[PDB]
Amino acid sequence: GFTMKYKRGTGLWDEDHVNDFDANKYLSARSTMRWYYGMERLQTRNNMNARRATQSYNNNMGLHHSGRGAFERELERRGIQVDKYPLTTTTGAARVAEMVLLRRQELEAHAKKAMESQRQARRRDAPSEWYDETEGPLNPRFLASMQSNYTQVITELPSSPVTGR
Amino acid sequence: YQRGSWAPGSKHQKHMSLNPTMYLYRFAGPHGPGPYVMKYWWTLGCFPTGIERPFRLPEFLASYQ
Amino acid sequence: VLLTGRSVWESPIDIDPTCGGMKSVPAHAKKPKRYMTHGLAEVGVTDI
Amino acid sequence: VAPWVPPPRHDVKVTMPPPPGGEVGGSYGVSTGYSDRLARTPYWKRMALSTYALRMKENETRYPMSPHREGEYDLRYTVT
Amino acid sequence: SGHNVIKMGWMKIGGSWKYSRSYNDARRGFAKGQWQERKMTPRFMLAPRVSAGGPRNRYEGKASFSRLSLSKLLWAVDTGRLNPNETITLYHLRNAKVIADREVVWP
Amino acid sequence: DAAWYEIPTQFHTHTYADGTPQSRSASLAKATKYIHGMPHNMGQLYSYHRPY
Amino acid sequence: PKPAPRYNIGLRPAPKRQNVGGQFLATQKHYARELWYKRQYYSTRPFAIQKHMGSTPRILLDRTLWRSCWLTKSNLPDVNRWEKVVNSQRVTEDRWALVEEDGVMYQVNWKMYCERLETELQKAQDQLPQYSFMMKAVP
Amino acid sequence: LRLPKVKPGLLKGIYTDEKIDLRDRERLELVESIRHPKERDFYQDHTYHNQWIARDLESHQKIQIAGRYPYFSPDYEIKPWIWYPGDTVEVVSGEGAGQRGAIIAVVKYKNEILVQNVNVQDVVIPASETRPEQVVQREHPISVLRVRHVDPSTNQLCH
Amino acid sequence: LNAPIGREKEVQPGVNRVVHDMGNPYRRSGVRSQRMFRDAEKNFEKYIRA
Amino acid sequence: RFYRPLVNQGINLWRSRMGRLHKGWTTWEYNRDVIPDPRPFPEPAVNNYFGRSRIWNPIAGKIGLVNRKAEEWGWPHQRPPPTGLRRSPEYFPFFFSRYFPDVEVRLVLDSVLNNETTRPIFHIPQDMSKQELVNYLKNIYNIDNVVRIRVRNMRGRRFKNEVGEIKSLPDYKVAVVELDSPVSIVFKQ
Amino acid sequence: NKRVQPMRLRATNNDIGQASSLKEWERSSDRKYGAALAPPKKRDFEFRV
Amino acid sequence: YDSRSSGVHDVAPRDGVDFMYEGPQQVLPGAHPLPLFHPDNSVTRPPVSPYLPSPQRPHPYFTTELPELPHFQTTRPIVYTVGTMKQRIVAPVFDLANNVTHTRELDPFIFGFYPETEEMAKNLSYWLVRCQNFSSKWDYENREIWRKAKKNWPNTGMGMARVGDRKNHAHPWGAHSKPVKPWNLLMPTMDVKTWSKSNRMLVTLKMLQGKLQIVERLTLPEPTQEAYLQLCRTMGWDVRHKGGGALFMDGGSRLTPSSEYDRAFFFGSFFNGRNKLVRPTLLCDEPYDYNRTSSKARTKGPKGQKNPIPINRFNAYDALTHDTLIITEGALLQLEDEMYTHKLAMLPPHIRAQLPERGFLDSEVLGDVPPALQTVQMEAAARTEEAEQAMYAPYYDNPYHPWQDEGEASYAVDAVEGTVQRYIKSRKTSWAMLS
RNA sequence: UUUAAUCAAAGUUAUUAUUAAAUAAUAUUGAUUUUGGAUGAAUUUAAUUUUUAAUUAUAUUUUUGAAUUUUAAUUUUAUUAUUUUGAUUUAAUAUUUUUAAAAUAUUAUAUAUUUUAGAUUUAAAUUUGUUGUUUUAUAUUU
RNA sequence: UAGAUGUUUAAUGUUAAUUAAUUUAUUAUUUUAAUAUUUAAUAUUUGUUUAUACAAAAGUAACUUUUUUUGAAUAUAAAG
Known part of the structure; x- marks a missing residue:
């Protein structure tokens, strides 16, 4: 009946507008793949039947499988374009995805060079007031990460509090 | 009619209208085959009602095998 | 096989896993092909 | 059993499928027409055996009327 | 986790049912509806009904507008939802979320 | 994924270790007589309902 | 959004069909106890066997049930062992017993602790001048 | 799993030195005569x-x-068969975890193995009036699910 | 019976004990569900080794 | 939408008039459309009895032919044999019968042991008539001193295996062939 | 639900609106905004049955 | 109660594990003057944070630019709201080599929304019921038992009970008259108000505890599972099944945001432990239900919203069953973008009227600002849409220039037909609507 | 040999299993062996009706005597469904069960707590001139 | 002793984030279907003596090797 067919294949990802009422608050790592291969399946398994339908249906109504008939077969021969708005196609939008992927790979390349500048500019060896713990102690399992910034050993705090010098 | 339970090995009286029995001479009770239904199991071969089936296996794995 | 300790490869008994079921199965029976099947068979996930 | 299932009623066209029965003399009950010979015939073939002048002459429409039953509505496009 | 035995109050499960007669009637959905009052005839049987349609019969075509306060409008042009430069119509109100769309019914 | 068996392992085999289907079903019924009956290796059965 | 009907929060098992409860409260299935080990109302709780009622188990030992019944051939492979989980590793140490001492309790091998009793008792009785003899099924 | 498990007659409590079951076949003349002659049982x-x-x-x-x-199931064997007579295999789990011994015979349809000196038991041989009761020691078929191969170089686990 | 990924010797000690595998619940299912999970014990080793 | 029937009579409560009876069984609720099972449950059409009164089912099955199709000629693949050949003594299944008979004439060793008997006894299949047997002794064993052949169509012997599953030995026939000469068997003694 | 009030006797415009104003109805162009209360569309003059 | 007065503890110590009490000078394992069910120190659940959470410093992070590493700003400017923390939240982002490259502000709207329990409950209460197999909750009914229809005995003359057609719940074959079928249950509804608001107060609690950590990239250099488990040892993600594990919101690098994961990581992200991987958004779709009135009586599945939240979103059950939250900087940008138009409409008017001054409302469409850094997919769709901005030129139905002629129309009412028609230079351009 | 007679039963049993139920949208001339057998009518189930086809609203309106709401995007995906992971996940889990253990108060009659006495409606429902109606329960476990 | 003026269950309980002593608060008087009593030291059973005709349907708990005819095929015991 009415079930909103105009929303099924209209999600951003492939997991929305689909009743997965059979969920489980802990899906094992084997049972998460299957949930992805599942939600990934009933979008192709869904339409790959609605394509087989409408192509096998035109073959029986006497048209081109795509939906073209006699007239819109001639126009393409005359050189006239037949459809009003030719929407960007597979080779079109799977080519734009090679733009915003290629400048970012070049923007993220040069960002290596701009990060090294503003990181080898302000490159102290004694940390500033952030090295205080007059309020709250420090996380020694984190100091192992700031250590690669300076040379002076931040990874050694005395058992007494650190005034932050 | 039907004073006890509905199983064939029940305890009180019954009737053949409500709970029509098959006439089973002697079958095994709920606690196992007593020494009366085994006098057949070693002579007749199977329990005398005919309905039960003679699983003579673990004796065959006792003697022959 | 226990007494001597010999080897045996093919089962000595012709089991019928149908128990007289194939008397009702046409000799041309063979399962169809199902596309886009569900399960992690086509992807052998030895990692998890 | 049936040796030689009979063919459809009026498959005279080469591209469009035959009209439903009754219209051409048969049993009412379907609003479509399906020529298995037409479908199994591929596209490059179905377009081969015709010309543009002819394709526009069997795609021909009579929508408010029937092309076979004179004075009768198109029982392909009726409710039943 | 209790039983609202009428005329007796909340009662424990497993409690006393001796005094829950009319409660076993309400649960069964069975409605006597004070029908033992045969003697006193209610306004129902004696109320002349005007208007073979009804007192407020909203027949098709009846021009029953949905009320929009004017003070709700002047509050949304200084809040900033409505631009007083432009001819304010029904499209903005719906889009400025001034009024919901459940309010708007013909006319 | 054609790997999934297109003839079920539950179906009684062709019984033809030669390498070809032996009469398909036709002949399992002839050899199921050999199953519902008694096999050839069969030695002394133990039960008290015995053939002779 | 009317708040969610979390009756049995999780993760206590489901109720059993009271005279009270919403149309949404999912009770337990008819003819199915809610406390699995309470078959017989006075059934004592099992020792180290908790049926993983719930989602797929994170770590599943061999002595814990999961859509199954108990089976000494599969739920307990070697009774001389005792499987644990140390650092998320299903390790199987030795089984012991809390035998007695001068006033301390020190663990000794649970296979060795039972080799004595199987013998020290069997060697206790056989040197008792009797002849115990039960004849079963007197007609 | 909580209290020790010993011979079923010692802590259980009813300790008999010789149990006799009368429902057996050997003791038929002992029961068929104990009951009265007036106890007629039909359908003999x-x-x-x-x-x-x-x-x-x-x-x-x-x-x-x-x-x-269990092998009466369809395809009980192990889908590839990798265990053969003469293989160099060590057990893994269960009884005697870790012994090494070469296969001598394989029971394929059962997913098990006969391996030298591992899981050896005494195959008693009941005999008729000619020979007396004979006992024979003999290692037993062990499941291939609990053995792995002795790699001729690394001598470790190896599929 | 737990300690961070480096302090793995300092647990409550035990007796003769050998880590069998990780208790991946699918070890119970048929062998084709144990042909998966084959290397998941190998891979997990060097994750807790420093 | 369907709108459920309604059963709360009160202020209106006048089903006596327009109210058509809706006590008519509630088809809408059971709408799960998969047939229930017939209350007198038809047994499986397999014959369970196995004793000496095992009758033969006359009703002609369906898959029976569809397997005897593929066993005289590959049915779904190979084309049907022309009927002139199909209904001929050269139709292979009949061809392999006039030149490759397949019978089993099992003489009971018990009959002619150390004794001397002029009437041996044969466990011949049930299809073989009296004449068909004499022509089988005279042509294959060259025994050509038959006088009269009797027939005792005996049902095969039942038994139960160690588990206790009913089995049977294929039916046979007992043919007391009256020989002309006393024949025995010289059991080595 | 102590929250809600009694459903009124006669319909109100918010009830006639909220009924067909849910998300699930957002595309039901006809019958939206109380089309069943307006006078009908002037039907075609070449209309026939 | 207080039965079992003896026989609990054997009156003896254990061998080498029992210690008597020395005195009040030494400290026992576990003792703490607060009721803690999951007792944790900074060794078992070590928070990955500069400082250690405290009542003094409002959050275990920098509240001021440390000048020994560059400072990044958020993508969208930050305005403080009701539940915001009202203080800067500068969080050092990390590198896959377990370093601290740069420091970055965090939007107080998302990461500084001070938590409340009466709302994170609605997040959990929703999950514990949504994350639930309904179809398993199927029991038989009275009318599915297949028994005789007649009273199984005449109710009067028999010495039995007054019962007919015994197929009821009292019997070991019957079933409940009103049993629990799947479609009777409830999938609760959950709008965008109380989903976002709940979720944003969970990524704040994950900060206030110190279990928050922004990461540059989450790509594995190769799609194996070794590179995953090795990535956690160096970066320090205890992900063993028992020890507390990480939660991986994934959105790609800073310059290359991507709503979908990285096939390298996605394939290596599968490991049987306390690891999760969620979509890089906190908002969710608007709840609808079509079978709201049992209209489709062939349906299976609970009453209520027929648009449930997919399991791989960020919820409140795996927000706490996985202790460490691991956000990528690509995920950050998307959170600040989708929540942007949300925090602005949630401001008072007098304050919403100052945003166009403070550079909050620089519309990438009116050209008043170059286009902002957008997700790889959502920019791809902006290059497509910009590309075809020309094909609608010759038609009067153009969507970018709609109603080109609303200045020359000359509306004319006629009283023979019910028509108000408009003419564009004496030529009728209205369209009689077809039926 | 004397027992004056009486008085008690508490708290454990082997050796074998993977089946049910709901869920999944990819089959289909009837489940239980070889038709007719004359070469022929055995083996026929068809007809414009809520039908193995199963319907997103609260308004109006027929006697207000109960009835009840319209394409959602036109071959687009609410579709009648199982598989080389014990198919998947959830929910449920059992006999053949065959097992089995001990000397305190009294001794001329009123009912357990041992100082010896004292103390007694079996419950539930039913009965609102019957609280005291005239039914139900052997006990055990589910 | 003890909150209070007396009828809407208490629970992270081996964290359904656990792994060797949980010693899990848990049981509906009756309508259920299984067992166990009590009637029960019981009622009823209890096998030393009578007079022989054939079909069919009826069963097939059932076996057969042993003489069916000079008919080819078929079938020769048994309840209600």
């Missing part, structure tokens, strides 16, 4: 209902017969 030779109908087994009966002969 013929049963009442028709017994040549085919019938199933008790619920508990199958449960015992399915565990004994």
Whole structure:
């Protein structure tokens, strides 16, 4: 009946507008793949039947499988374009995805060079007031990460509090 | 009619209208085959009602095998 | 096989896993092909 | 059993499928027409055996009327 | 986790049912509806009904507008939802979320 | 994924270790007589309902 | 959004069909106890066997049930062992017993602790001048 | 799993030195005579209902017969067969975890193995009036699910 | 019976004990569900080794 | 939408008039459309009895032919044999019968042991008549001193295996062939 | 639900609106905004049955 | 109660594990003057944070630019709201080599929304019921038992009970008259108000505890599972099944945001432990239900919203069953973008009227600002849409220039037909609507 | 040999299993062996009706005597469904069960706590001139 | 002793984030279907003596090797 067919294949990802009422608050790592291969399946398994339908249906109504008939077969021969708005196609939008992927790979390349500048500019060896713990102690399992910034050993705090010098 | 339970090995009286029995001479009770239904199991071969089936296996794995 | 300790490869008994079921199965029976099947068979996930 | 299932009623066209029965003399009950010979015939073939002048002459429409039953509505496009 | 035995109050499960007669009637959905009052005839049987349609019969075509306060409008042009430069119509109100769309019914 | 068996392992085999289907079903019924009956290796059965 | 009907929060098992409860409260299935080990109302709780009622188990030992019944051939492979989980590793140490001492309790091998009793008792009785003899099924 | 498990007659409590079951076959003349001569039991030779109908087994009966002969399932063997006579294999788990011994024979349809000196038991040989009761030690078929191969170089686990 | 990924010797000690595998619940299912999970014990080793 | 029937009579409560009876069984609720099972449950069409009164089912099956199709000629693949050949003594299944008979004439060793008997006894299949047997002794064993052949169509012997599953030995026939000469068997003694 | 009030006797415009104003109805162009209360569309003059 | 007065503890110590009490000078394992069910120190659940959470410093992070590493700003400017923390939240982002490259502000709207329990409950209460197999909750009914229809005995003359057609719950074959079928249950509804608001107060609690950590990239250099488990040892993600594990919101790098994961990581992200991987958004779709009135009586599945939240979103059950939250900087940008138009409409008017001054409302469409850094997919769709901005030129139905002629129309009412028609230079351009 | 007679039963049993139920949208001339057998009518189930086809609203309106709401995007995906992971996940889990353990108060009659006495409606429902109606329960476990 | 003026269950309980002593608060008087009593030291059973005709339907708990005819095929015991 009415079930909103105009929303099924209209999600951003492939997991929305689909009743997965059979969920489980802990899906094992084997049972998460299957949930992805599942939600990934009933979008192709869904339409790959609605394509087989409408192509096998035109073959029986006497048209081109795509939906073209006699007239819109001639126009393409005359050189006239037949459809009003030719929407960007597979080779079109799977080519734009090679733009915003290629400048970012070049923007993220040069960002290596701009990060090294503003990181080898302000490159102290004694940390500033952030090295205080007059309020709250420090996380020694984190100091192992700031250590690669300076040379002076931040990874050694005395058992007494650190005034932050 | 039907004073006890509905199983064939029940305890009180019954009737053949409500709970029509098959006439089973002697079958095994709920606690196992007593020494009366085994006098057949070693002579007749199977329990005398005919309905039960003679699983003579673990004796065959006792003697022959 | 226990007494001597010999080897045996093919089962000595012709089991019928149908128990007289194939008397009702046409000799041309063979399962169809199902596309886009569900399960992690086509992807052998030895990692998890 | 049936040796030689009979063919459809009026498959005279080469591209469009035959009209439903009754219209051409048969049993009412379907609003479509399906020529298995037409479908199994591929596209490059179905377009081969015709010309543009002819394709526009069997795609021909009579929508408010029937092309076979004179004075009768198109029982392909009726409710039943 | 209790039983609202009428005329007796909340009662424990497993409690006393001796005094829950009319409660076993309400649960069964069975409605006597004070029908033992045969003697006193209610306004129902004696109320002349005007208007073979009804007192407020909203027949098709009846021009029953949905009320929009004017003070709700002047509050949304200084809040900033409505631009007083432009001819304010029904499209903005719906889009400025001034009024919901459940309010708007013909006319 | 054609790997999934297109003839079920539950179906009684062709019984033809030669390498070809032996009469398909036709002949399992002839050899199921050999199953519902008694096999050839069969030695002394133990039960008290015995053939002779 | 009317708040969610979390009756049995999780993760206590489901109720059993009271005279009270919403149309949404999912009770337990008819003819199915809610406390699995309470078959017989006075059934004592099992020792180290908790049926993983719930989602797929994170770590599943061999002595814990999961859509199954108990089976000494599969739920307990070697009774001389005792499987644990140390650092998320299903390790199987030795089984012991809390035998007695001068006033301390020190663990000794649970296979060795039972080799004595199987013998020290069997060697206790056989040197008792009797002849115990039960004849079963007197007609 | 909580308290020790010893011989079933010692802490259980009813300790007999010789149990006798009278429902056996050997003791038939002992019971068939103990009961009175006035206790007549009919259907000694013929049963009442028709017994040549085919019938199933008790619920508990199958449960015992399915565990004994599991290979009657379709394709009980191990999908590739990698265990062969003469292989160099070590056990892994269960009884005697870690012994090394070469296969001598394989029972393929059962997913098990006969391996030298591992899981050896005494195959008693009951005999008729000619030979006395003979006992023979003999290692036993062990499942291939609990053995792995001795790699001729690394001598470790190796599929 | 737990300690961070480096302090793995300092647990409550035990007796003769050998880590069998990780209790991946699918070890119970048929061998084709144990042909998966084959290397998941190998891979997990060097994750807790420093 | 369907709108459920309604059963709360009160202020209106006048089903006596327009109210058509809706006590008519509630088809809408059971709408799960998969047939229930017939209350007198038809047994499986397999014959369970196995004793000496095992009758033969006359009703002609369906898959029976569809397997005897593929066993005289590959049915779904190979084309049907022309009927002139199909209904001929050269139709292979009949061809392999006039030149490759397949019978089993099992003489009971018990009959002619150390004794001397002029009437041996044969466990011949049930299809073989009296004449068909004499022509089988005279042509294959060259025994050509038969006088009269009797027939005792005996049903095969039942038994139950160790588990207790009913089995049977294929039916046979007992043909007391009256020989002309006393024949015995010299059991080595 | 102590929250809600009694459903009124006669319909109100918010009830006639909220009924067909849910998300699930957002595309039901006809019958939206109380089309069943307006006078009908002037039907075609070449209309026939 | 207080039965079992003896026989609990054997009156003896254990061998080498029992210690008597020395005195009040030494400290026992576990003792703490607060009721803690999951007792944790900074060794078992070590928070990955500069400082250690405290009542003094409002959050275990920098509240001021440390000048020994560059400072990044958020993508969208930050305005403080009701539940915001009202203080800067500068969080050092990390590198896959377990370093601290740069420091970055965090939007107080998302990461500084001070938590409340009466709302994170609605997040959990929703999950514990949504994350639930309904179809398993199927029991038989009275009318599915297949028994005789007649009273199984005449109710009077028999010495039995007054019962007919015994197929009821009292019997070991009957079933409940009103049993629990799947479609009777409830999938609760959950709008965008109380989903976002709940979720944003969970990524704040994950900060206030110190279990928050922004990461540059989450790509594995190769799609194996070794590179995953090795990535956690160096970066320090205890992900063993028992020890507390990480939660991986994934959105790609800073310059290359991507709503979908990285096939390298996605394939290596599968490991049987306390690891999760969620979509890089906190908002969710608007709840609808079509079978709201049992209209489709062939349906299976609970009453209520027929648009449930997919399991791989960020919820409140795996927000706490996985202790460490691991956000990528690509995920950050998307959170600040989708929540942007949300925090602005949630401001008072007098304050919403100052945003166009403070550079909050620089519309990438009116050209008043170059286009902001957008997700790889959502920019791809902006290059497509910009590309075809020309094909609608010759038609009067153009969507970018709609109603080109609303200045020359000359509306004319006629009283023979019910028509108000408009003419564009004496030529009728209205369209009689077809039926 | 004397027992004056009486008085008690508490708290454990082997050896074998993977089946049910709901869920999944990819089959289909009837489940239980070889038709007719004359070469022929055995083996026929068809007809414009809520039908193995199963319907997103609260308004109006027929006697207000109960009835009840319209394409959602036109071959687009609410579709009648199982598989080389014990198919998947959830929910449920059992007999053949065959097992089995001990000397305190009294001794001329009123009912357990041992100082010896004292103390007694079996419950539930039913009965609102019957609280005291005239039914129900052997006990055990589910 | 003890909150209070007396009828809407208490629970992270081996964290359904656990792994060797949980010693899990848990049971509906009756309508259920299984067992166990009590009637029960019981009622009823209890096998030393009578007079022989054939079909069919009826069963087939059932076996057969042993003489069916000079008919080819078929079938020769048994309840209600």
